[PDB]
């Protein structure tokens, strides 16, 4: 039915396949000297997924001249049948890793400066990003979180929306400003902190 893959900007293509039982993704980069497969494993009742690890985690294995033909192959007895296929331009399908290494730089009674790191991405992409940040507060849900979206070259944010002496959690996600099918990264692991008491 649907065959969707994303590239983390370095050396990791992750594919998801859902159809209405032994299947693989075959990766065939045009005019390169290697091919690679991964075994599609159940991820939901509906879909399968696996990752094509192209090299070391911070290695720039692909560029904008690369074209990776991606095939879903499944076992039809002793023959392998092509179930889905796409020519994959990697930088048209970016989805970065979730930001990591969150830490409270400085917390006060109504504000908090939180910084993070962008992993497995060239310094180029750090300068062409959009960020989204949200907070969790007592009595509310992540869906009710106030959302902040920011187009900036900056891996920190000073939240102004806080109340004193309160427990919070903070999450951030990233999206490059390029690529037709580029999507948001997953949310970072939530960072817990508490605002200071009112003086």
């Amino acid at each position, epitope marked *: 039915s649907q065959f969707t893959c994303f590239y983390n900007s370095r050396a990791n293509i992750s594919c998801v396949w859902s159809q209405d039982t032994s299947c693989q993704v075959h990766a065939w980069p*045009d005019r390169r000297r290697w091919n690679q497969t991964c075994e599609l494993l159940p991820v939901s009742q509906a879909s399968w997924a696996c990752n094509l690890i192209l090299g070391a985690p911070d290695s720039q294995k692909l560029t904008t001249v690369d*074209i990776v*033909t991606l095939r879903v192959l499944c076992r039809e007895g002793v023959r392998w049948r092509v179930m889905a*296929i*796409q*020519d994959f331009k990697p930088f*048209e399908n970016l989805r970065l890793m979730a930001p990591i290494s969150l830490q409270v730089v400085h917390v006060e009674t109504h504000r908090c400066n939180i910084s993070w790191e962008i992993s497995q991405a060239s310094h180029y992409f750090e300068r062409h990003l959009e960020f989204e940040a949200r907070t969790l507060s007592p009595g509310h849900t992540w869906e009710e979180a106030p959302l902040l979206t920011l187009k900036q070259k900056q891996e920190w944010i000073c939240l102004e929306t806080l109340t004193p002496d309160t427990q919070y959690e903070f999450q951030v996600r990233v999206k490059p400003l390029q690529g*037709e099918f580029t999507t948001w990264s997953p949310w970072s692991q939530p960072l817990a902190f508490r605002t200071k008491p009112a003086a």
Partner: nanobody
Amino acid sequence: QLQESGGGSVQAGGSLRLSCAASSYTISSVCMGWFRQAPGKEREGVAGIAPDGSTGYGDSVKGRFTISKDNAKNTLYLQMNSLKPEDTAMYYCAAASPGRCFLPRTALEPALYYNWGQGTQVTVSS
């Protein structure tokens, strides 16, 4: 959407020409291909054309068939020459999703396509 035409009856050694009317966008932007399905056989690839105009053909029809597009007329063609009885089958055109295909060898894969024509019959007499 996709509408085949030009499919009829010819004798062996003849030469026919299929037409597939499509949108202005698909004719200019997306991979397209011709496929055939003989009775008791699966749909096999005949010819494929990539967005850059590059082409590819199945082994059985190489040299005889020619795939082409006309952006002015919004039409895909399959010029088939020197037809043989083996070429008797239902012929289908198909158009790929935009941005999902750039090479004619991929455009030859039936698994690529979710938009197909109704098919046109082509019979060749021995």
